[PDB]
Protein backbone atom coordinates (compact mmCIF):
# COMPACT_ATOMS: atom_id res chain seq x y z
CA UNK A 1 0.00 0.00 0.00
CA UNK A 2 2.50 2.57 -1.24
CA UNK A 3 5.57 0.33 -1.42
CA UNK A 4 7.80 1.05 -4.43
CA UNK A 5 9.22 -2.46 -4.20
CA UNK A 6 5.78 -3.82 -5.05
CA UNK A 7 5.56 -1.50 -8.03
CA UNK A 8 8.90 -2.61 -9.42
CA UNK A 9 8.66 -6.32 -8.68
CA UNK A 10 5.59 -8.19 -9.91
CA UNK A 11 3.68 -10.35 -7.46
CA UNK A 12 4.56 -13.80 -8.77
CA UNK A 13 8.32 -13.20 -8.64
CA UNK A 14 8.01 -11.71 -5.18
CA UNK A 15 6.03 -14.70 -3.96
CA UNK A 16 8.48 -17.07 -5.63
CA UNK A 17 11.46 -15.41 -3.92
CA UNK A 18 9.67 -15.24 -0.54
CA UNK A 19 8.78 -18.90 -0.69
CA UNK A 20 12.31 -19.90 -1.62
CA UNK A 21 14.01 -17.71 0.97
CA UNK A 22 11.76 -18.97 3.81
CA UNK A 23 12.45 -22.55 2.80
CA UNK A 24 16.17 -21.88 2.71
CA UNK A 25 16.30 -19.81 5.90
CA UNK A 26 13.45 -20.96 8.17
CA UNK A 27 15.01 -19.38 11.28
CA UNK A 28 14.97 -15.99 9.52
CA UNK A 29 12.29 -13.67 8.12
CA UNK A 30 12.37 -11.56 5.00
CA UNK A 31 11.52 -7.90 5.51
CA UNK A 32 11.08 -4.96 3.12
CA UNK A 33 11.64 -1.53 4.73
CA UNK A 34 10.71 1.73 3.00
CA UNK A 35 10.08 5.29 4.05
CA UNK A 36 6.34 5.95 4.62
CA UNK A 37 4.48 8.11 2.10
CA UNK A 38 5.13 11.81 2.76
CA UNK A 39 7.70 11.05 5.42
CA UNK A 40 10.44 13.67 5.87
CA UNK A 41 13.38 11.66 7.04
CA UNK A 42 16.77 10.23 6.12
CA UNK A 43 17.12 7.53 3.51
CA UNK A 44 17.81 3.89 4.18
CA UNK A 45 20.73 2.64 2.13
CA UNK A 46 19.19 -0.82 1.84
CA UNK A 47 15.60 -2.01 1.53
CA UNK A 48 15.78 -5.81 1.98
CA UNK A 49 16.55 -7.44 5.29
CA UNK A 50 16.85 -11.09 6.22
CA UNK A 51 16.35 -10.94 9.94
CA UNK A 52 16.78 -13.63 12.60
CA UNK A 53 13.37 -14.62 13.80
CA UNK A 54 14.34 -14.25 17.46
CA UNK A 55 15.44 -10.56 17.17
CA UNK A 56 12.79 -8.30 18.78
CA UNK A 57 11.01 -5.48 16.98
CA UNK A 58 12.93 -3.16 19.37
CA UNK A 59 16.30 -4.47 18.28
CA UNK A 60 15.36 -4.23 14.63
CA UNK A 61 14.15 -0.67 15.31
CA UNK A 62 17.49 0.38 16.87
CA UNK A 63 19.27 -1.39 14.04
CA UNK A 64 17.42 0.67 11.46
CA UNK A 65 17.90 3.93 13.41
CA UNK A 66 21.62 3.27 13.29
CA UNK A 67 21.60 2.61 9.57
CA UNK A 68 19.84 5.91 8.92
CA UNK A 69 22.46 7.58 11.19
CA UNK A 70 19.71 9.29 13.12
CA UNK A 71 20.73 11.55 15.95
CA UNK A 72 19.42 10.71 19.38
CA UNK A 73 16.87 13.56 19.13
CA UNK A 74 15.46 12.30 15.84
CA UNK A 75 12.20 10.33 15.89
CA UNK A 76 11.39 7.14 14.05
CA UNK A 77 8.12 5.15 13.87
CA UNK A 78 7.35 1.78 12.25
CA UNK A 79 4.07 0.94 10.55
CA UNK A 80 2.91 -2.52 9.51
CA UNK A 81 -0.61 -3.17 8.15
CA UNK A 82 -1.85 0.11 9.57
CA UNK A 83 -0.53 -0.55 13.10
CA UNK A 84 2.55 0.36 15.07
CA UNK A 85 4.17 -2.98 15.99
CA UNK A 86 5.03 -3.64 19.65
CA UNK A 87 8.75 -3.47 20.52
CA UNK A 88 8.63 -6.69 22.55
CA UNK A 89 7.34 -8.85 19.69
CA UNK A 90 9.88 -10.95 17.84
CA UNK A 91 10.40 -10.35 14.13
CA UNK A 92 9.30 -13.97 13.73
CA UNK A 93 6.01 -13.30 15.47
CA UNK A 94 5.55 -10.06 13.59
CA UNK A 95 6.19 -11.91 10.37
CA UNK A 96 3.66 -14.65 11.14
CA UNK A 97 0.96 -12.14 11.98
CA UNK A 98 1.65 -9.63 9.27
CA UNK A 99 3.40 -11.12 6.21
CA UNK A 100 1.54 -10.56 2.95
CA UNK A 101 0.67 -13.08 0.27
CA UNK A 102 4.15 -12.78 -1.25
CA UNK A 103 5.65 -14.17 2.00
CA UNK A 104 7.30 -10.81 2.78
CA UNK A 105 6.83 -8.56 5.74
CA UNK A 106 6.48 -4.88 4.91
CA UNK A 107 7.52 -2.12 7.30
CA UNK A 108 7.00 1.55 6.55
CA UNK A 109 9.12 4.06 8.48
CA UNK A 110 8.59 7.69 9.26
CA UNK A 111 9.49 10.71 11.38
CA UNK A 112 5.93 11.31 12.62
CA UNK A 113 3.08 9.32 14.18
CA UNK A 114 0.85 10.20 11.19
CA UNK A 115 0.03 7.68 8.55
CA UNK A 116 -2.19 7.37 5.50
Amino acid sequence: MGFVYKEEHPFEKRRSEGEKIRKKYPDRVPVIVEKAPKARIGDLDKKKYLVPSDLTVGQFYFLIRKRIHLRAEDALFFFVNNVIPPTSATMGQLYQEHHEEDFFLYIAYSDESVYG
Binding site: K46, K48, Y49
Partner: peptide
Amino acid sequence: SDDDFWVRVAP
Protein backbone atom coordinates in the same frame (compact mmCIF):
# COMPACT_ATOMS: atom_id res chain seq x y z
CA SER B 1 16.48 2.25 -1.58
CA ASP B 2 19.06 -0.31 -2.78
CA ASP B 3 17.12 -3.56 -3.31
CA ASP B 4 19.82 -5.73 -5.00
CA PHE B 5 20.45 -8.09 -2.11
CA TRP B 6 19.22 -9.13 1.29
CA VAL B 7 21.13 -7.82 4.25
CA ARG B 8 22.05 -10.77 6.44
CA VAL B 9 21.41 -9.42 9.92
CA ALA B 10 23.60 -10.86 12.71
CA PRO B 11 21.79 -12.89 15.39
